[PDB]
């Protein structure tokens, strides 16, 4: 993965013009410093290994965190799976138009103690369950529901105090690549929704406490980490300048191209 | 000389006498779909003399206070001959293009244009909670134009056409990462771009998905002195290359 | 019962590790691959494409297309300066935002050469000559054309070929430089001057423009990936 080394150069007086080109051809000039001045011969041992597509994207990044309470009605979490709610991972994946990768998925579950009124609260270790529902299956409506059986849905159980849980997901798509951008509609009538929301059908992730509420309430929080493996990328794209506003679309409020200085000659 | 070209496609011909090179895609030429990459089982239609020919869109005027124009690419030719009549009767279709932008002036005019072809160019809305409608995103074979100011948020379904953000929330100077070419009135006269089929699926419906967008943006504005010709037009011709269709049903 | 012994670093989550993990959907059949044009393998091919740099940041030009145009006219004296900016490709606000300077904000170190292309978007009847200099640090900024001719320079004559390339070379004590603003690893200055005047005929406008592009050579390299300081967030996007 080594970079190219420079060669020696002599004084020239010729009809060859390496520096003069035409930028109107849509073509970048391939000149080196050993064409426009006198150079010495060095050999470079530098590598281009840390700027690969694999080394750039294969790193864990937090995509969501949700809370749920042990002794409350309406106390279980859900999340419709996407990658467009955090600012840092959304900007890295959107330097390319199409992507294709396997996934690695890690959860970090903590807990806290809520102000009860009983004397001598003493709880055992807590067990949590995270169930993944593919699009079209039945959803849970409460904590003590039949849908947490997981006959065919994959789910993971975890006891507090151990190493964090971790799975691996293949390239689960209908098309030949994941699409970061989509210029079109859902209906053929060209009404309704517009954009990447027409392509996002990846499921829902549910979270609950398996234990029952003994004497004090407990508020847990699970953080979700994504990590792309075996990455392929096509059609690079300029990085995003304006700040992100929504999850479903591209909309923005306009901003200047750079920050400003006082004069064109000031350094 | 390297300044003359001649492109023949069907019964149409383009000649030019001063030009740069022709930019072809990401290094690939348009070609028909293979057998190990296809998914639809029925036999495709390849008419290829009636649709693969040069179609000329309308002309726009380059003024001094001008900001830019854009066209959505498999929608401008949706009423053009037998290319727009095959799109209505068929469900799927794939197509590469060749685009020839032409703008001529004298040696006493000055200016510069950026001619770029961007795939999957989602435009943004002025009101931050909605999405723009179809009539604002594209017109058939007529240009939609940018503005040098900012559209207000009181307009519900309109496109945010601040030209320095290029409508998509990026820097307009970084648009040279796509296949592009410049028209410099000092040296150039036309720009020719050949684009292959770029999508994540082998075929796609040509009515609810525009996979290419042609933007023409003046970085250096038009300027001339008194007595010179003030009316300067810009004309775009687009020819499909290796078009084929699947799924014949009623006319829609 | 094979006897083992667990070391420090057990049951930890280091976010840049490389292990194997059991699959959640076993015997899944993925969609077969397709030949899509434009496959990128290294991020050092995006940075080698040149992009227009906004030299004209004068506080009412940033929200317009006037930030990219450098004004060039016909003078009455000789030796005036066109522009000038320091060569900090990841810290200086001129090169902060270009296609090379946005990849550099993900990394900490950089090393290699840098190209600078200049296109003359004037009339076909206008002439001119320019001096495109680069000065290594240690002294100040060159204040005259006589100071700037003592560095690495090229003399550009406009004509049929309307572009010229200034290739600022790698002159450094260390093998790498810092992307952030560091006084120990400063890189120098890039200036432009009038060699001769801009001589136009009658009925030609005497005020022209110049575009500038910036890219990298084939020996460019980056190191020590980090997070960018440009994107930011307070609440979740919904």
């Amino acid at each position, epitope marked *: 993965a080594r970079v190219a080394d420079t060669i020696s150069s002599r004084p020239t007086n010729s009809e060859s013009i390496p520096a003069l080109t035409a930028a109107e051809t849509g073509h970048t000039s391939q000149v080196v410093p050993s064409d426009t001045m006198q150079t010495r011969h060095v050999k470079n041992y530098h590598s281009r290994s840390e700027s690969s597509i694999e080394n750039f994207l294969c790193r864990s990044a937090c995509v969501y965190y949700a*809370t749920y309470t042990n002794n409350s009605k*309406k106390g279980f979490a859900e999340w419709v799976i996407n990658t467009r709610q955090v600012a840092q991972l959304r900007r890295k994946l959107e330097l390319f138009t199409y992507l294709r990768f396997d996934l690695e998925l890690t959860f970090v579950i903590t807990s806290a103690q*809520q*102000p009860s009124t009983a004397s001598s609260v003493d709880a055992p270790v807590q067990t949590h369950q995270i169930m993944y529902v593919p699009p079209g299956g039945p959803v849970p409506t409460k904590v003590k529901d039949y849908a947490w059986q997981t006959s065919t849905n994959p789910s993971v159980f975890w006891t507090e105090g151990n190493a964090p849980p971790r799975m691996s997901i293949p390239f689960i798509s209908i098309g030949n690549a994941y699409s970061c951008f989509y210029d079109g509609w859902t209906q053929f009538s060209r009404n309704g929704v517009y954009g990447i929301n027409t392509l996002n059908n990846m499921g829902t992730l549910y979270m609950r406490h398996v234990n029952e509420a003994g004497q004090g309430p407990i*508020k847990s929080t699970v953080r979700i980490y994504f990590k792309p493996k075996h990455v392929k990328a096509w059609v690079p794209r300029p990085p995003r300048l304006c*700040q*992100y*506003e*929504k999850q479903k679309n591209v909309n923005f*409020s*306009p*901003i*200047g191209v750079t*920050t*400003s200085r006082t004069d064109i000659i000031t350094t | 000389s390297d300044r003359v070209r001649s492109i023949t496609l069907g019964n149409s011909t383009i000649t030019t006498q001063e030009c740069a090179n022709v930019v072809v895609g990401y290094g690939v030429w348009p070609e028909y779909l293979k057998d190990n990459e296809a998914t639809a089982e029925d036999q495709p239609t390849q008419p290829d003399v009636a649709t693969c020919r040069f179609y000329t869109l309308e002309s726009v005027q380059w003024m001094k206070n001008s900001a830019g124009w854009w066209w959505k690419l498999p929608d401008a030719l949706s009423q053009m001959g037998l290319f727009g009549q095959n799109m209505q009767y068929h469900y799927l279709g794939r197509t590469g293009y060749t685009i020839h932008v032409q703008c001529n002036a004298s040696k006493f005019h000055q200016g510069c244009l950026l001619v770029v072809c961007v795939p999957e160019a989602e435009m943004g809305c002025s*009101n*931050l*909670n909605n999405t723009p409608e179809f009539s604002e995103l594209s017109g058939g074979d007529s240009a939609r134009m940018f503005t040098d*100011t*900012q559209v*207000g*948020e*009181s307009n*519900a379904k309109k496109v945010q056409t601040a030209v320095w953000n290029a409508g998509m929330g990026v820097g307009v100077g970084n648009l040279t990462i796509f296949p592009h070419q410049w028209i410099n009135l000092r040296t150039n006269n036309s720009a020719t771009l050949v684009m292959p089929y770029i999508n994540s699926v082998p075929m796609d419906n040509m009515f609810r998905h525009n996979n290419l967008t042609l933007m023409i943006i003046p970085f250096v504005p038009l300027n001339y002195s008194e007595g010179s010709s003030p009316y300067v037009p810009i004309t775009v011709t687009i020819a499909p290359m290796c078009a084929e269709y699947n799924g014949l049903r009623l006319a829609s | 019962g094979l006897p083992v012994m667990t070391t420090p670093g057990s049951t930890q989550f280091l976010t840049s590790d490389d292990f194997q993990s059991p699959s959640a959907m076993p015997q899944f059949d993925v969609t077969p691959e397709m030949q899509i044009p434009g496959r990128v393998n290294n991020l050092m091919e995006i940075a080698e494409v040149d992009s227009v740099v906004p030299v004209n940041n004068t*506080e009412d030009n*940033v*929200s317009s297309l006037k930030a990219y145009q450098i004004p060039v006219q016909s003078n009455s004296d000789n030796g005036k300066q066109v522009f000038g900016f320091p060569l900090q490709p990841g810290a200086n606000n001129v090169l902060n935002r270009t296609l090379l300077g946005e990849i550099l904000n993900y990394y900490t170190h950089w090393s290699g050469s840098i190209k600078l292309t200049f296109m003359f978007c004037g009339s076909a009847m206008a002439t001119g000559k320019f001096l495109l200099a680069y000065s290594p640090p240690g002294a100040g900024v060159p204040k005259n054309r006589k100071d700037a001719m003592l560095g690495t320079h090229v003399i550009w004559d406009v004509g049929l070929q309307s572009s010229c390339v200034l290739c600022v070379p790698w002159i450094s004590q260390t093998h790498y430089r810092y992307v952030v603003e560091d006084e120990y690893t400063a890189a120098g200055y890039v200036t432009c001057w009038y060699q001769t005047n801009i001589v136009v005929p009658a009925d030609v406008q005497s005020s022209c423009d110049i575009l500038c592009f910036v890219s990298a050579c084939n020996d460019f390299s980056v190191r020590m990936l980090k997070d960018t300081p440009f994107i*930011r*967030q*307070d*609440t*979740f*996007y*919904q």
Partner: antibody
Amino acid sequence: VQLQQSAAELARPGASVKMSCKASGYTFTTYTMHWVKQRPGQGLEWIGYINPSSRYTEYNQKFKDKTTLTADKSSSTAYMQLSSLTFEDSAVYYCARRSEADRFVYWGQGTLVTVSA
Amino acid sequence: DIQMTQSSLSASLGDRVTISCRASQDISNYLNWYQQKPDGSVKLLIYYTSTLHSGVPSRFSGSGSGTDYSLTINSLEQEDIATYFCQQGNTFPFTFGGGTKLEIRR
């Protein structure tokens, strides 16, 4: 990060005032800054905002002809000028920084405007 | 314009308080709740129907869909005695609801 407003002001009916909101702790030209008015017996009310990078302002249709918003990038301040002052314009005026979509995370402390003779 | 209809509530400490506010049309879960202290400082509490801002204690919760929405404080303290507004972020312009003040019961 915090926003710091100016002192309380007093004016005659027919005069003009000019309030400020000195923002520190962040890049001023990135986020727009909105102005909210609270009359002491009723609820909050939106006036308008100004994009500091492009100097573009947008007003509510009730305060379209009376208020004027300006800004400067050097000292990182946002000004608001009230004109043709009547007895309805004696309230508390807040400057707020709009978050991701429609949220106001950071507010000013408010200036008390009152008209009298 | 969307009318945001919400005047004074009374509750003892350690009790559950419920503040509600009704819009005119469907706003589709784009509601925010603010809190104005009696010295005159405003802060964001819940930046969706239910999602809490960072730095807000767990006493506060939100619920609702469509037109009817609500705010719940399950255990009242002395720090939570303030005025609460609801604001919609759906259409132009931004409209705030009226206040709702809390007070001690007896």
